[PDB]
Ligand SMILES: Cn1cc(-c2ccc([C@H](NC(=O)OC(C)(C)C)C(=O)NO)cc2)cn1
Ligand SMILES: [Mg+2]
Ligand SMILES: [Mg+2]
């Protein structure tokens with residue numbers, strides 16, 4: 046297993062100037078002819094000419110039209126094509142080849158493959174070598190001239206990068222199209238699509254140069270009515286890059302294409318973005334509400350890549366976060382501006398501190414710029430993407446909007462033609478930092494540690510107030526736990542956005558202030574502080590850290606009620622919950638360990654319950670925020686704070702706390718569930734696909750959250766509400782009616798009803814599958830086997846497999862059944878899946894990521910299944926590398 050190291054970067058001894066492709070698609074084979082116009086680079090030392098080429102069937106290879114012969118002048122081992130140095134020309138030469146590939150049996154969805162009746166490619170990161178021979182790495186920039194031919198009736202629509210410059214008929218009912226794309230690009234941005242595609246279409250006129258851009262969004266004919274929101278999102282994305290960043294689109298046309306089989310959300314191929322159908326297609330009649338933010342995010346994300354990834358490119362894959370962290374950051378800014386809801390930022394923080402913090406304290410922990418890799422497919426992590434985005438976001442926090450924009454423009458204008466590194470970005474930001482602080486002596490060299498140092502920093506606080514001198518102090522400490530990447534962790538540059546709240550009237554006591562913590566500890570003093578404040582810390586979640594606020598629950602309640610920052614309010618609530626959870630967990634644990642016949646539990650703080658009631662009953666308060674405060678912290682957030690977590694005890698803890706709050710607030714919950722109905726389920730714009738109301742969707746989120754709480758509590762006659770809910774036109778509602786009915790005898794009735802409503806829309810059915818999968822059912826194992834037999838069967842669609850199994854793995858009580866049968870079941874699915882799609886198999890390993898955090902029995906049960914998986918003779922490199930790292934081998 047070959048390991049690549051970041052320090053080892055060296056430019057190729059070769060240059061590829063021009064790629065000329067002929068891709069001839071037939072029913073049981075695809076013929077790929079390729080001419081590579083090549084040169085010798087200044088780094089050449091007479092080495093062999095080695096191409097990447099995986100799974101290719103060689104018909105012929107040539108140099109300067111001279112056929113090469115195997116054994117004599119080259120060798121091929123299904124991974125690398127080696128041409129011996131003695132036969133490699135010393136100046137400009139032409140390499141050509143003709144290979145056969147088979148998209149129709151390519152179930153790994155990398156390279157060229159068939160998704161239903163669409164031929165489609167995926168080349169990032171190392172998929173282009175599955176189509177034809179290449180020096181498959183992102184610093185090999187080339188021009189592309191691409192011809193695609195296929196049966197006209199099956200594949201009337203032909204797409205590749207660049208301009209279509211010819212369309213022609215071919216004897217035998219075939220046709221071809223030629224695409225020339227003169228600007229240089231890396232091969233991972235190559236793409237091709239062939240199929241019977243239907244489209245929606247628009248023309249966008251850019252803001253400053255008034256260029257006309259044709260916008261096309263494509264799908265299979267059956268779902269062409271689900272394309273409208275996507276097109277609106279694209280328009281919105283283009284406008285935002287123009288308005289915030291002053292950046293216009295540079296090409297004549299942009300195509301978005303949906304396919305049913307895709308490993309991830311989407312891909313930014315130049316002028317030809319290709320999407321998982323679940324991240325491009327929606328209609329109000331057969332999509333749940335989440336689809337609308339999801340499409341907005343993914344369309345936005347792939348668009349913003351056009352600058353941050355496509356015009357400014359990567360030197361090498363270790364720079365991945367430079368395009369991914371930065372593009373997520375740009376999409377985050379976009380989505381916050383489009384949704385105008387505070388829950389947008391809250392949801393990203395919620396995801397970071399659950400999923401990414403878990404990864405960062407796991408054996409898989411890595412910095413956002415790793416030092417090494419084996420399988421590129423394992424590089425695309427929540428650390429690289431989401432912590433990466435928080436690192437990119439901190440620059441904006443430190444600089445402010447004006448200087449951030451100056452810095453970002455410096456970066457783009459300087460690197461627009463070229464490859465870049467994380468250092469280049471920091472450099473540009475630093476120029477802004479110098480200008481802001483007004484001395485060319487200022488620097489951000491310490492900031493680079495955010496790229497190289499792994500692990501989550503912990504930031505803790507102590508406070509002092511002198512009533513007489515009106516002087517307030519915030520003493521701050523930072524610490525990162527040592528791990529395998531650094532034995533000695535260094536202090537980071539941590540920006541701490543803060544406010545000081547007067548507890549007497551709830552007013553701000555100081556202007557907007559960002560503390561720059563650059564040492565292991567510092568003391569920040571404020572004068573003329575009239576009364577003892579309550580500190581509002583890390584507003585907006587201004588750094589990706591564990592916040593230890595050392596506030597009392599009384600102070601936290603006051604913040605939750607009166608602070609101006611959504612995140613600090615939400616975090617104060619989170620912290621109140623965590624204190625309660627840790628306390629009750631230990632009480633339950635001791636009773637279990639000591640086998641107590643009787644014992645006490647600490648009740649939920651009554652003033653906290655009162656504050657929840659106050660906020661819920663405030664007609665001016667935000668509905669999305671409300672749904673957060675009545676929900677306990679995610680299980681994967683909690684587990685960061687507990688050693689040897691017994692999942693049963695945590696489940697009992699959660700139950701107790703939920704029942705405590707419900708015994709006080711259920712009438713309030715019910716009252717609101719009823720009063721929110723009119724606005725939440727307003728059908729006025731149900732048949733307008735361009736009308737999306739994020740506040741209204743948050744109102745539904747709150748209703749469905751309250752209905753869940755009321756159903757679990759068996760609130761009097763709530764089943765009537767559930768039945769009526771099942772008749773709602775909104776899938777978010779009638780699928781919720783299914784899951785909350787889990788606690789009633791009408792479950793399988795609503796199961797059948799909702800299945801009937803879902804079965805004829807591919808994506809909707811997948812949402813139905815998720816809903817069944819996450820149903821709080823005691824017979825959930827039996828239910829899953831029914832899904833397997835009647836619906837999922839032997840589907841190789843990653844959407845189908847992920848829908849059936851992943852939501853179930855978040856069933857705390859059942860997935861973690863002490864028999865280990867949950868672990869056994871998923872490991873079976875991973876091994877099964879690994880046979881045809883290693884990337885998705887590794888995705889299905891997600892629940893195992895916390896294995897060494899659980900109680901000793903469950904650790905052992907998970908380790909046994911991982912070792913069993915590792916012993917499979919046919920295990921992919923992808924899965925083996927992942928499980929080896931995860932199990933500390
Ligand atoms: C075979 N292979 C595919 C990949 C890969 C992984 C992630 C994406 C990411 N896809 C994705 O939908 O990301 C969102 C949800 C928008 C943040 C990506 O960066 N798209 O631009 C794109 C491609 C690596 N190897
Ligand atoms: Mg405009
Ligand atoms: Mg070591």
Ligand SMILES: [Mg+2]
Nearest residue numbers: 305807840842
């Ligand atoms: Mg299907």
Ligand SMILES: [Zn+2]
Nearest residue numbers: 346350369372
């Ligand atoms: Zn991306």
